[PDB]
Ligand binder design. Structure first.
Ligand SMILES: CC(C)S[C@@H]1O[C@H](CO)[C@H](O)[C@H](O)[C@H]1O
Ligand SMILES: CC(C)S[C@@H]1O[C@H](CO)[C@H](O)[C@H](O)[C@H]1O
Ligand code: NA
Ligand code: NA
Ligand code: NA
Ligand code: NA
Lengths: 211, 211
């Protein structure tokens, strides 16, 4: 959840918001180790429930999200239903565990390609065009993340937009991401320069991946 | 319906057969002028019912078809339901009126392209990949006719097969068609040659379109 003024500005200027619970357990092995564990349900529940209690009156918020990259655990299904019960006015989405689990109203993959399948075991990233028509599938698809804009990037961006415009159930996505997470450091003469991972003696680090 | 031995040979050699009623009203304006007219229901009904009565014990017959290029009329709906009632063992298909009407269990377009939409009013031929995922659509898609093999043709055939293999609900199609409808004529010297439309003094004619 963002600084409260963010929603006020989105209400007034006009932007659709996905408001997202502060839950990410990316580094766990497997990713759902905590989210499938009932002992972590209390802690997870408060990150979801308290977000809804704070932000449910903002018109800019159109979609709730259970968090990010925490696999798919029974705790997600429980909190999905909690939101659906408390606030019927907004769809709930969540990408973890393969982007099309029972904890999501929207097929919301990250970095699924337009035409190319990436058939990873357990959590495949189908071509988005293919994903829509999988046997029994009926939901809209909106990429929670796509077109990773790291450095000299956004190659193939037009391929997404051609597809979004051709397929009714391909309803767009959220580019990753808005702003480089570089930090200011200063040389011996006080001149500022942009620093990334590792530049503060931080180790292990993931270098320029913050930008 | 074919010569009765055909089905015997398909039973024994092993070919899947679509058995199709002898109903085609292509030249009507609009195409459904007779098939939507209850006056023509009796004539139509016999072409469907007597086919099913004849061929229903052949294992090679896996799908019933209500005919060809006769638009979509209420008579199709009645006869679709008749077959479903009398023979639940086989899906019923029919392409007329846009290939995805209430008279077909299978989206069965003719000459719909792989990636390119052709958005004709009333009867669009969507990209087959796009067609599968239209809001609310869940049926399998098998082209009743594709890859018109007229003369030096079948360019882009590989594109169909790539899509068939990638998409579960794209379950293939029927090439148009098997054998040139040329007829043997003889010249002044009694030498045989292959003839097409118009070569018998027949007019109006559609020339080489029979091949
Ligand atoms: C590097 C991948 C295995 S994880 C990948 O890292 C990215 C780096 O910017 C983003 O954080 C994405 O959300 C994440 O899926
Ligand atoms: C020419 C189109 C307007 S109709 C087109 O003609 C073809 C000619 O071989 C085939 O008969 C197809 O079945 C038919 O759709
Ligand atoms: Na769209
Ligand atoms: Na990053
Ligand atoms: Na297929
Ligand atoms: Na022909």
């Amino acid at each position: 959840p963002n600084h409260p003024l963010w929603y006020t500005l989105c209400d007034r200027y006009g932007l659709y918001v996905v408001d997202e619970a502060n839950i990410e357990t990316h580094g766990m092995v497997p990713m759902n180790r905590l989210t499938d564990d009932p002992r972590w349900l209390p802690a997870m529940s408060e990150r979801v429930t308290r977000m809804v209690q704070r932000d449910r009156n903002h018109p800019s918020v159109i979609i709730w999200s259970l968090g990010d990259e925490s696999g798919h655990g029974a705790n997600h299904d429980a909190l999905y239903r909690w939101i659906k019960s408390v606030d019927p006015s907004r769809p709930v989405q969540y990408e973890g565990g393969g982007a099309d689990t029972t904890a999501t109203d929207i097929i919301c993959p990250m970095y699924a390609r337009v035409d190319e399948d990436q058939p990873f075991p357990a959590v495949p990233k189908w071509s988005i065009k293919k994903w829509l028509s999988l046997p029994g599938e009926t939901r809209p698809l909106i990429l929670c993340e796509y077109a990773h804009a790291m450095g000299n990037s956004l190659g193939g961006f037009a391929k997404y937009w051609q597809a979004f415009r051709q397929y009714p159930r391909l309803q767009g996505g959220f580019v990753w991401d808005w702003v480089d997470q570089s930090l200011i450091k200063y040389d011996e003469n006080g001149n500022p320069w942009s620093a990334y991972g590792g530049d503060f003696g931080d180790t292990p680090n993931d270098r320029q991946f913050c930008m």
